[PDB]
Design a protein around this ligand. Structure first.
Ligand code: HEM
Ligand SMILES: CCc1ccc(C(=O)O)cc1
Ligand SMILES: [Cl-]
Length: 393
């Protein structure tokens, strides 16, 4: 029989220090009942990974946040890709995949590295820098909206927009409800840049709109796939990169390790995604009666998956609380797993690698010199400010 926990994985307290709670979450039982929100949760690597790889049983089309789309109105029209099941998923999925293939990365790869090299140089010129706003936020801001082919004007909405989207997967918090109350300007901006007339020749939005021509997607579909990349494509990478730098900061020996061997960049990043897990949690909904870690769970029940917890399960990882940039990271669920696994992963790693590469060649120490402020959001873990003094090589 399934234990009750009073933990609220969406309270400021939990965000501020999740690690003791996530350990109660695991130790309690393979499946737990969260009184705060009347839902089942699963925090161990094994359970999380299983749920992820049975989309037939654990569907996403009833929402991947708490809210059940069968029971209640989605807060916005649903994603053609996040909030759908195969087969409706498979087409929109395949398209975004071509858009963001390794072929594509090869073409934009030099540009991303050069821009990464430029930021780290400028930063070394100043010394004291905010690792979040001046790097984590600034770098993908200098590469991604361009890769998208966004205009200049409006971009200040891209981050609040992400925040809104990720806050909304959560329970009906103060966090959620406020985000929603404040959402109109952010949606109008995104709705606008979602249109073909507004996407520069040769960028993702443009490349996406091309699938209109051949018919792989309709014109209603097209603005909505773009919408996908404008929700998911930015703040994720802000927090990913954010994690990496914070890790390097807290783990100076691991920085020295990376400097010794700069080819360890890609994986020092991947490790950071495991170790922080910028995207913390997602739900599914049972499509049938299913036995899940010994419990028989009824049809149409929501299950909360602790991604971060999975990624830090002692049952799966030696010394999981450690930053180890030569860890065999393969199998972490930082970008999820299976049919829905992050279609954007190549862009993220692209950014995380070039930037960690630039750092490994350019910086000799990263020390935090200041107050460190966390940002609170229902789905995203990350920092709001991280003051560091960069010392040059
Ligand atoms: C720090 C980098 C990133 C992280 C940690 C991350 C996280 C995730 C996770 C955990 C999923 C699985 C969702 C699920 O199982 O329901 C996912 C899927 C997705 N990601 Fe990412 N992501 C990142 C970067 C990106 C980027 C750069 C893009 C756009 C270029 C993107 C676009 C998407 C989209 C559209 C999906 C839904 C795919 C599907 O359901 O088939 N992500 N991401
Ligand atoms: C990375 C999480 C995420 C993935 C896809 C969407 C979307 O399709 O709007 C929104 C969020
Ligand atoms: Cl929207």
């Amino acid at each position: 029989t399934i234990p009750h926990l009073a933990i609220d994985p969406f309270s400021l307290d939990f965000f501020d220090d999740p690690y003791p709670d996530q350990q109660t979450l695991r130790d309690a039982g393979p499946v737990v009942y969260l009184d705060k929100w009347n839902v089942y949760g699963v925090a161990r690597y094994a359970e999380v990974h299983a749920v992820l790889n049975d989309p037939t049983t654990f569907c996403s089309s009833r929402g991947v946040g708490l809210s059940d789309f069968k029971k209640e109105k989605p807060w916005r029209p649903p994603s053609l890709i996040l909030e759908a099941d195969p087969p409706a998923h498979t087409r929109p999925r395949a398209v975004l995949s071509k858009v963001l293939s390794p072929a594509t990365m090869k073409t934009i790869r030099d540009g991303f590295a050069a821009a990464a090299d430029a930021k780290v140089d400028e930063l070394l010129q100043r010394g004291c820098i905010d690792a979040i706003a001046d790097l984590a936020e600034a770098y993908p801001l200098s590469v991604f909206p361009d890769a998208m082919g966004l205009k200049q004007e409006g971009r200040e909405h891209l981050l609040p927009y992400a925040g809104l989207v990720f806050n909304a997967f959560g329970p009906p918090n103060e966090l959620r409800q406020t985000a929603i109350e404040r959402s109109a300007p952010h949606q109008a901006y995104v709705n606008e840049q979602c249109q073909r007339p507004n996407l520069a020749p040769g960028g993702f939005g443009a490349c996406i709109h091309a699938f209109t021509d051949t018919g792989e997607i309709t014109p209603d579909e097209a603005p909505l796939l773009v919408r996908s990349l404008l929700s998911a494509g930015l703040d994720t990478t802000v927090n990913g990169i954010g994690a990496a730098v914070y890790c390097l900061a807290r783990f100076p020996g691991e920085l020295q390790r990376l400097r010794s061997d700069p080819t360890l960049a890609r994986n020092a990043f991947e490790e950071a995604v495991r170790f922080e897990s910028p995207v913390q949690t997602f739900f599914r909904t049972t499509t049938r009666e299913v036995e899940l870690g010994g419990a028989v769970i009824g049809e149409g029940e929501k299950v909360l998956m602790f991604l971060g917890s999975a990624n830090r399960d002692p049952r799966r990882w030696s010394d999981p609380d450690l930053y180890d940039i030569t860890r065999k990271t393969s199998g972490h669920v930082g970008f999820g797993s299976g049919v829905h696994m992050c279609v954007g992963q190549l862009v993220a790693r692209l950014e995380g690698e070039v930037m960690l590469s630039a750092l490994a060649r350019k910086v000799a120490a990263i020390d935090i010199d200041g107050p460190v402020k966390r940002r609170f959001n229902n789905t995203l873990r990350g920092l709001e400010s991280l003051p560091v003094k960069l010392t040059p090589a």
